[PDB]
């Protein structure tokens, strides 16, 4: 009745600065008690889609390791964060595996990530040579080469920085404002689980 390892989630959320999506973080959580109920005490969600495990029973269902990812993406691209869904932000920056498991929180932050002149502190990948194998990151910025001539180590005609910045401003309408997205990935194997819900007991 003395719940003590409330898994740290008030920090995976509310961090006040989500990193851009070209280079997403990856926080591994284990060895605590994860009462996901607190998650439902933020703003109404543009998307709460759970794919492997039914969402209401998130208390009692147990785990070995959980993985928390977070980034910021243009609104009408939220749907691209779902297994086997092609498109830019899902084939160049964050590729789910089509045997994925876990849930996908996605809420709105229009008040928190715009400036009257316009933010540019979120850059996403726009060019590469081929798509990504699932669950992989490429923070590197090699000046992309398009034409038959080399770029000589810098940008040039038909050789441009693969990263490109968002423009976030308060005047932008719904569907092009920054939605903050977080993805919880699950997995089960032969290891000390120790990831279960809080016992409902009586003193």
């Amino acid at each position: 009745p003395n719940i003590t390892n409330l898994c740290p989630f008030h920090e995976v959320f509310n961090a006040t600065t989500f990193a851009s999506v070209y280079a997403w973080n990856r926080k591994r959580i284990s060895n605590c008690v994860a009462d996901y109920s607190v998650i439902y005490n933020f703003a109404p969600f543009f998307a709460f889609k759970c794919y492997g495990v039914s969402p209401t029973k998130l208390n009692d269902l147990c785990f070995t390791n959980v993985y928390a990812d977070s980034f910021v993406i243009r609104g009408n691209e939220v749907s691209q964060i779902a297994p086997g869904q092609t498109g830019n932000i899902a084939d160049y920056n964050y590729k789910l595996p089509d045997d994925f498991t876990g849930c996908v929180i996605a809420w709105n932050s229009n008040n928190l990530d715009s400036k009257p002149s316009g933010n540019y502190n979120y850059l996403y990948r726009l060019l590469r040579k081929s798509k990504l194998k699932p669950f992989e990151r490429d923070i590197s910025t090699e000046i992309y080469q398009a034409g038959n001539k080399p770029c000589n180590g810098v940008a040039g005609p038909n050789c441009y920085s693969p990263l490109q910045s968002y423009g976030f401003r308060p005047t932008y309408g719904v569907g092009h404002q920054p939605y903050r997205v977080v993805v919880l990935s699950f997995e089960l194997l032969h290891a000390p689980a120790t990831v279960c819900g809080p016992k409902k007991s009586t003193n």
Partner: antibody, heavy 128, light 110 residues
Framework: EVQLVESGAEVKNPGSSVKVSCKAS????????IIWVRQAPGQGLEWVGG????????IYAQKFQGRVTITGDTYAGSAHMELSGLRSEDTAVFYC?????????????????????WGPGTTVTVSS | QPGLTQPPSVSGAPGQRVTISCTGS?????????VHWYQHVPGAAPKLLIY???NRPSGIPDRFSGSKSGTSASLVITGLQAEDEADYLC??????????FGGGTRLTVL
């Protein structure tokens, strides 16, 4: 949804120039690049200009090469295009359209695939 | 216009399968290039119907279709209706000069 607001009609004389915009809703062209096409009266269509606004790499049709220039903003972007030396054979309608692919595999190859959402077009007329 | 010529217009019987042509060179379509089918409302903004020579954009019910063959391509409507009375258009790239557009057929129904 995406809507492409654009200015009203233009009336002027031979040899002059006209500048018209492609006002886009919610302002973020967001790497969706813009194609500028003419509607000749009683005839088909003729592509004129093409601009990928974030990268800023711009191409023009050989017929009007050096006769027309295009610019764009892409953040509350309202990409502008102006045609110079208007004459009798230039009175037409102006359309601007997107490409809807916005990533490198086919956006530097842009002018191949498609143009998704178009605009009402604006009539430009020579005086004669 | 070094464009994509096709017959000017075809009248419309009600509710059938009608085909429309788009003929060009091998040097501008045949080599690798793709054709593209637009629907145009006279006085309004046109609409896409077919891209990548074969695929079918969403929002278009299966009435429309089309394909390519050798040195030409074509489009087809099943179950003709009066709302389809409109301009039709086919475009492609041009090794010769950038992008090339066809005449446009004024599909009419009587």
């Amino acid at each position: 949804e995406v809507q492409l607001v654009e200015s009203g009609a233009e009336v002027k004389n031979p040899g002059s120039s006209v500048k018209v915009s492609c006002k886009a809703s919610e302002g973020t062209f967001g790497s969706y690049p813009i194609i500028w096409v003419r509607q000749a009266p009683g005839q088909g269509l003729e592509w004129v200009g093409g601009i990928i606004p974030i990268l800023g790499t711009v191409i023009y049709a050989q017929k009007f090469q050096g006769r027309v220039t295009i610019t764009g903003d892409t953040y509350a972007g309202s990409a502008h295009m102006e045609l110079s030396g208007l004459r009798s054979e230039d009175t037409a309608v102006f359309y601007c359209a997107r490409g809807s692919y916005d990533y490198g595999d086919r956006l530097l190859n842009y002018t191949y695939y498609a143009m998704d959402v178009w605009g009402p077009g604006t009539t430009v007329t020579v005086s004669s | 216009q070094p464009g994509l010529t096709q017959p000017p217009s075809v009248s419309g019987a009600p509710g059938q399968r009608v085909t429309i042509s788009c003929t060009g060179s091998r040097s501008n379509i045949g080599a690798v290039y793709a054709v593209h089918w637009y629907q145009h409302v006279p006085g309004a903004a046109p609409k896409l119907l077919i891209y990548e020579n074969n695929n079918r954009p969403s929002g278009i019910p299966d009435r429309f279709s089309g394909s390519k063959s050798g040195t030409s391509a074509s489009l087809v409507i099943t179950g003709l209706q009066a709302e389809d009375e409109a301009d039709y258009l086919c475009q492609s790239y041009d090794r010769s000069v950038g992008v090339v557009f066809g005449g446009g057929t004024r599909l009419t129904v009587l």
